[PDB]
Design an enzyme around this catalytic site. Structure first.
Site, PDB file in Angstrom:
ATOM      1  CD1 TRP A   1      -3.472  -0.227   1.046  1.00  0.00           C
ATOM      2  CD2 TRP A   1      -2.347  -2.095   1.532  1.00  0.00           C
ATOM      3  NE1 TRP A   1      -4.321  -0.964   1.099  1.00  0.00           N
ATOM      4  CE2 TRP A   1      -3.700  -2.290   1.312  1.00  0.00           C
ATOM      5  CE3 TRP A   1      -1.727  -3.251   1.788  1.00  0.00           C
ATOM      6  CZ2 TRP A   1      -4.568  -3.350   1.861  1.00  0.00           C
ATOM      7  CZ3 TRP A   1      -2.275  -4.318   2.034  1.00  0.00           C
ATOM      8  CH2 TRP A   1      -3.484  -4.417   1.526  1.00  0.00           C
TER       9      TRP A   1
ATOM     10  CB  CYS B   1      -9.019  -4.698   0.119  1.00  0.00           C
ATOM     11  SG  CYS B   1      -9.756  -3.350  -0.151  1.00  0.00           S
TER      12      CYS B   1
ATOM     13  CG  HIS C   1     -12.408  -3.826   3.593  1.00  0.00           C
ATOM     14  ND1 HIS C   1     -11.104  -3.908   2.941  1.00  0.00           N
ATOM     15  CD2 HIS C   1     -12.639  -4.781   4.297  1.00  0.00           C
ATOM     16  CE1 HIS C   1     -10.581  -5.063   3.343  1.00  0.00           C
ATOM     17  NE2 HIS C   1     -11.452  -5.653   4.077  1.00  0.00           N
TER      18      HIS C   1
ATOM     19  CG  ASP D   1     -11.873  -8.904   4.512  1.00  0.00           C
ATOM     20  OD1 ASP D   1     -10.917  -8.917   3.579  1.00  0.00           O
ATOM     21  OD2 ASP D   1     -11.728  -7.832   5.333  1.00  0.00           O
TER      22      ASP D   1
ATOM     23  CE1 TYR E   1      -9.007   0.308   0.146  1.00  0.00           C
ATOM     24  CE2 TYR E   1      -7.049   0.759  -0.931  1.00  0.00           C
ATOM     25  CZ  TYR E   1      -8.115  -0.056  -0.265  1.00  0.00           C
ATOM     26  OH  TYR E   1      -7.563  -1.534  -0.352  1.00  0.00           O
TER      27      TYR E   1
END
Lengths: 708, 710
Positions: free
Chosen positions: B260, B295, B354, B377, B541
């Site tokens: 990220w 994600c 998300h 997830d 984000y």
């Protein structure tokens, strides 16, 4: 004294104590509830429809009142508060004595008031009630706290205020999130009861009439007769749990006496009733159980009770109901050694249809997830306590087999999930299970649609589609919590040598003959010989046989892939004689594939099409104006009917009525002209029925449209 | 000298032992699987689209087969059975060795082949698989009984048969009862991923490509890599549970390595990816975690994996997302005494959005009532196990707060139910709880609609309506099972003196300026004074801030009954300089009521609108015919983009392709034409992406209808 308790129970909404007038400045000349049925209050509270003079309002919502004083209200020294009290023993701790204090800002579900404008002598308040308030008829007194003592108003009967549940208020335990659902489930005073049998579903209108003059008061009367503790009357679970038990009379107790004898010597035959109004009024006046009601009658009355008080409710019909089940998930059908239907024991009977209610509410006594529609069945049957109404049982718990959660879930679970077990009552006292039918049992569950008079399939609410994983699991779950399947169905039962056999029964008319087509579909590459048996019985809608009327027997042969259709013809003069009130016949088609000895069995029932009553209206469809109405019933039988009662009903159009005709010659036509002077506008229905000491269970309806 | 267990573990679908050819004279000449993509097996089984030669069938449903013998099958004294095997250590009792008995009737629930037609030397069978069958690539044999033993066929790759999950069969756990849902959730290989932020919902197409050449095998390799027990591969629960944990490479083991940092030096930036095919294929060839995903990428790849195996699955976007909670139902926001936002430690941020997956399955491990959609997830987070994927957690349990039921429920619960808590970090080391925002987190939960590319609101499957009774009790039952509220909002927050402050924000494109309108409205009959502050950050984000591009302050006076609106213009010059990959921006507007001491807090986020790639097809749109595609990108910046990469994808139309452009002049226009020859017809879709160093996260899609070759 009374070492039992300090203050006696406060259980009568009719009993009243009188608060002391004087234990000093400011005194109220008049109080102004803005009653009037077109006025802001009733209208905004959706209580404009009750034919009631007092103010009716819904808990959890505000209303306006204007208090007039002897001199300007002076916010500096002047101090007063409204009081609401109920029962003969209020106790602020218990919710029966409620002091509304004048406040700055009204907040979430908390009794409160606001001076919303004050003028020369008059303060206009916006009082709000708690969404957990008790439901009943309250007394209002305005108190003023003078430094010496409080001086309050006098008992003023014209200010009595009713507070009902409020499906509209998001904090009410009875909150329906949809308007359409609220009009139907709460506001509609007319409904439809679906009967007959799965293949030939019949319907009939019923006047719930919750807004009719005097119903509200008798519903309160019901709870009083039940000695229902006032602090409980604001809880949906208890109101319905207690109300449902008063509907059926246990000697002198409840509202209606049940009766399933085709005679009905001392009362109104169950089939006669056109609505609830007629029944509740009779109850209150007589203060004694009304004579003769049956399953859909009990639900009709109980549904009035729920919708009147403000609880969303609906009538539901189950097709092929396993009532009186004692939690057994198996109904027995005993067969003869040869293969004919035995009748020594084959005492258990399925109901063609059975009606119970569903009420809307939350369940804080159960895990989160079991709120919504709760099944309540006023038609008694033995449960844990001993022959009582059943529920509220959460439909969602019924559906997933969580029958351990309260209010008789298992007895209502077995009503719609039992297996038919066909067993051979042999000679040496031994029994062998031949075949099992896991699908007859709760074929269709239906309720009037929100739209209008159509049916609405609600079967999937009580159960999953067969063969899907969950369905096997739900059933196996209920078995963990007390539901029982005593006859171990060991392994398999049949195979039918892949011989299929059905049979359609051509739905006939009263007095007509009709054919009963039997069908064998040989699916194998073999030839088989079958000895199929036919047993046709006259039965009550409950499935209790009055007598067997035709018992034919067939030897038939199916060559490899020989689809062979055998046909019988039921003769009018054969059944016509012993027919019971609902005109249903039941058939048992068992059979024996002589090769493998695979007993095949199927059963069905049919109702004879009895025909409508004709209602026609001539005149002016305008509120307050005469309207002539004509009921026309033609005797279909070739026999004379005697002491014929015809009933005309219609909420908003007329108070239920009855008339008698000494006789109606065979094939004759009678006419009844009755003028009605409506008082409600819009879509209305006239309802009619006919009952004679011979035939009965005839109805008619007409939708008239009225305006002002 | 193997005391742990007698038979070693059968954990690779790719491993095979050899079955003995000997231990009467009815020897099979050949076997006929009707496995043509047009043939009735693939079509009746819905496996017709799958660039695969072999027979692909589905649990609990019969398929046709035909064996030919050397001398006619005499039922009276001949005996044979078809056998299906998996792995190097098969075993009947472990369902990894299946001897198919030649029955006279297809028994519902068990294996059995029925003789259909007998016509000389050839027997045409109708084989039926168990609905609880292990999913994988089995080997097929025909065993012929002999008084002196058993005669069996040789290893024959031509007959390798794939068995998958069956959403169409009612006895299957994975059974979806609606055709259209089976289509969207299983056969649809194109999908849309929703993003941006709650009130400026951006969407982009993602290629699941579950049917492309090689994916199915890659899915089976994921399970072999994890050394997943063959006996367990027929379990949707174990499958998704084990599948999910391989998406995020916990150092060497795994499909993707998430990053990220906005730089993505040694790999592919997560915003470049066009679909899953590219990734899964890079993974098997290299046999090492693919470089960089975030994600939505984790969700995309895992979606393919699911659908490709036959388990209905869909991608879900959660709006104000409280990731990395610790089953904690509260999120800390730290104020100063003035009212400014303190960033001493206000280290917890709510992700703009998300993405997580949902698999349709039954939950026979829980009470009846928990089957349906289960959230899984694959973006790790600390649960009871320690920084792993969470799930499968059943969405009904969640909405109901019955968070004690397995597969990391409190953690998924908290993603969608946290309360924002504003606390003042008083200088004496004390903290006051000023305001608490119960409605920010999980404002909206959306997913692509069944019909087309639209959005569908599935918010109410996770939560009851914020405001009702059932919403409270749920939350309270969550607390009965492990979810916690550390801070105690001690009967206070109340109506902050009756002063409503709010702030609307427009939204421009990169390079343009825009403005905010803070509207304070005095609802009481009093004069009021307020000191307001505006913190305007540039965020990733995930909420993580990189910099505060603007800090304001206002002092307002609210007379009795009145409105007020401060407008502020954000000069494109402050933010442009340091925007992050997704053009996300975050605003905090706090404000103190001088007289009452009442604190009013409000925060929102903004993404800057980026201009899309334009795709143009030309030529004949027909299977087999050439088709010219045109990708047109317009650098909306004032700098020269360096090392620009454009990506083209379209399952059934092209293998994903990428092209570089060393640099691209200010506001200029760059174009690429690539010829394509589709092999799949009907409604297809081209997807494209652009990533450079300076800019990325710009996309483009185009739907095309490929007619068929005569």
């Amino acid at each position: 004294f009374g070492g039992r308790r300090a203050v006696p129970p406060n259980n009568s909404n009719a009993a009243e104590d009188d608060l002391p007038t004087v234990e000093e400045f400011l005194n109220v000349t008049s109080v102004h509830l803005f009653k009037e049925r077109w006025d802001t209050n009733k209208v905004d509270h959706h209580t404009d429809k009750y034919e009631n003079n007092k103010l009716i309002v819904r808990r959890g919502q505000s209303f306006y009142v204007q208090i007039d004083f002897s001199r300007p209200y002076d916010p500096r020294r002047d101090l007063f508060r409204v009081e609401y009290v109920i029962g003969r023993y209020p106790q602020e701790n218990k919710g029966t004595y409620i002091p509304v204090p004048i406040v700055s800002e009204l907040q979430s579900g908390k009794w409160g008031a606001k001076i919303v404008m004050r003028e020369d002598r008059s303060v206009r308040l916006s009082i709000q009630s708690s969404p957990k308030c008790i439901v009943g008829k309250f007394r209002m007194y305005v108190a003023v706290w003078t430094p010496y003592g409080v001086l309050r108003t006098s008992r003023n009967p014209e200010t009595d205020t009713y507070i009902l549940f409020n499906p509209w208020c998001e904090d009410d335990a009875v909150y329906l999130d949809n308007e359409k659902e609220r009009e139907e489930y709460v506001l509609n005073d007319i409904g439809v009861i679906f009967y007959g049998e799965v293949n030939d579903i019949k319907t009939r209108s019923w006047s719930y009439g919750q807004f009719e003059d005097g119903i509200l008061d008798t519903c309160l009367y019901v709870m009083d007769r039940a000695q229902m503790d006032l602090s409980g009357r604001g809880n949906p679970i208890k109101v319905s749990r207690v109300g449902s038990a008063m509907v059926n009379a246990k000697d002198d107790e409840g509202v209606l006496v049940g009766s399933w004898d085709n005679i009905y010597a001392y009362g109104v035959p169950p089939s006669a009733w056109t609505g609830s109004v007629d029944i509740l009024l009779e109850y209150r006046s007589s203060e004694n159980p009304v004579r003769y009601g049956q399953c859909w009658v009990f639900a009709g009355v109980f549904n009035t009770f729920l919708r009147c008080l403000g609880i969303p409710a609906r009538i539901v019909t189950n097709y092929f109901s396993a009532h009186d089940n004692d939690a057994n998930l198996q109904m027995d059908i005993f067969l003869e050694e040869d293969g004919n239907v035995n009748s020594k024991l084959t005492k258990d009977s399925v109901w063609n249809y059975h009606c119970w209610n569903e009420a809307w509410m939350t369940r804080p006594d159960l895990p989160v997830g079991f709120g919504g529609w709760q099944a309540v069945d006023s038609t008694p049957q033995e449960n844990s306590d001993g022959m009582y109404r059943c529920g509220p049982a959460s439909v969602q718990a019924i559906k997933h087999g969580h029958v351990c959660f309260q209010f008789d879930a298992p007895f209502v679970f077995a009503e719609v999930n039992s297996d038919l077990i066909y067993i051979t009552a042999k000679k040496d006292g031994t029994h062998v299970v031949e075949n099992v039918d896991a699908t007859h049992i709760g074929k269709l569950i239906v309720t009037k649609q929100i739209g209008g008079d159509g049916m609405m399939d609600i079967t999937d609410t009580y159960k999953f589609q067969e063969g899907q994983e969950e369905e096997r699991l739900a059933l196996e779950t209920a078995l963990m919590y007390g539901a029982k399947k005593p006859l171990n169905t060991e392994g398999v039962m049949k195979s039918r040598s892949n011989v299929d056999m059905d049979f359609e029964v051509e739905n006939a008319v009263l007095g007509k003959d009709f054919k009963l087509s039997i069908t064998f579909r040989n699916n194998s590459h073999n030839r088989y010989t079958i000895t199929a048996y036919l047993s046709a019985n006259i039965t009550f809608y409950t499935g209790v046989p009055k007598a067997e009327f035709k018992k034919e027997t067939f030897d038939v042969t199916l060559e490899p892939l020989s689809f062979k259709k055998e046909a019988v013809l039921i003769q009018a003069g054969e059944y016509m004689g012993q027919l019971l009130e609902q005109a249903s016949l039941h058939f048992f088609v068992t059979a024996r594939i002589n090769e493998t000895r695979d007993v095949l069995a199927k059963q069905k029932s049919t109702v004879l099409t009895i025909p409508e009553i004709i209602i026609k209206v001539r005149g002016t469809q305008v509120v307050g104006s005469d309207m002539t109405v004509t009921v026309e019933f033609t005797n279909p039988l070739k026999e004379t009917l005697r002491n014929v009662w015809v009933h005309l009903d219609g909420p908003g159009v007329t108070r239920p009525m009855k008339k008698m005709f000494r006789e109606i010659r065979p094939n004759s036509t009678v006419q009844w002209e009755e003028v009605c002077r409506p008082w409600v506008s819009g879509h209305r229905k006239l309802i009619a029925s006919m009952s004679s000491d011979s035939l009965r269970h005839v109805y008619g309806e007409l939708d008239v449209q009225i305006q002002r």
